[PDB]
C-alpha cells in the first residue's frame, strides 16, 4: 500500500490587500518613585554658659 496520501504547502498570501496587519508596536512608559528619607541625627553637646 505504499503511496503518497497527502501534502502540505508553504504557501503565503501576498498582501496587496492589507488583510493581515501582523504584530503591533505601541509606545509606553513606566515610572519609578524614590522618596528621600531623613536619617537619625548626630549631636555635639556643648556647654551652655
Amino acid at each position: 500500500d505504499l503511496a503518497v496520501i497527502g501534502f502540505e504547502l508553504d504557501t503565503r498570501f501576498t498582501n496587496t490587500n492589507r488583510r493581515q496587519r501582523g504584530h503591533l508596536l505601541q509606545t509606553r512608559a513606566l515610572q519609578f518613585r524614590h522618596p528621600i528619607p531623613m536619617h537619625a541625627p548626630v549631636t555635639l553637646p556643648m556647654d551652655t554658659m
Binding site: 509606545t27 509606553r28 512608559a29 515610572q31
Partner: protein
Amino acid sequence: SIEDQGTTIHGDVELVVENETSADVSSVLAEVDQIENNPVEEVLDADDAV
C-alpha cells in the same frame, strides 16, 4: 516682629493694638505652590518621551 523672627532663644513678646486682624494664608502653605505647579510629577507623553 514675630513674623520675621526665627526661634528666638530669649523669646519675643508683642501686644495686639489692632481693632481687627485679617489673616490671608492662601499662599503660606508650601504644598499649595508644589501642587499649583505640578499636582503630580510632570511626565512626558509616551510618544513624546522617545
